[PDB]
Write a protein that binds this DNA or RNA. Sequence first.
RNA 1: ACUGAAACUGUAGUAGAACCAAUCGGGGUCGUCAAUA
Length: 113
Amino acid sequence: GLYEIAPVDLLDETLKPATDKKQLSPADRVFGWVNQRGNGCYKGQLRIHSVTCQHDDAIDDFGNQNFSVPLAILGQPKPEQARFYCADDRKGIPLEDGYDRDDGYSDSEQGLR
RNA sequence: ACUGAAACUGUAGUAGAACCAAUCGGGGUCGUCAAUA
């Protein structure tokens, strides 16, 4: 089945990425913005630079240069798990327990988490 | 019912001044998929 509402519709227009120079939120000013939908960009007011490691032997060679630990499974996020990614309110409150999956992206008064 | 002759369209003059190839982005991470018996 398909849920009835697309997740973009469960996000408020004031929380979506900014579409114009006048709707720049704090991080869009501090870190800057480029409009993904048209003209409009802003150079960020915050620049990170001069990263230096202090420790010379900072890297854990696990024993030999050829050793390698196999690293769990980093799976892809699956927002289809509406009980994990969907919120019962635009306050971000979780879905209620015990309801069937169709409850998920179900009403416009639902929110994203 | 006696051709005028002779005469450099040339001389001077910087396609140039100003303009940031640049703005935003963690090499990141979980549950789905199939439909019957």
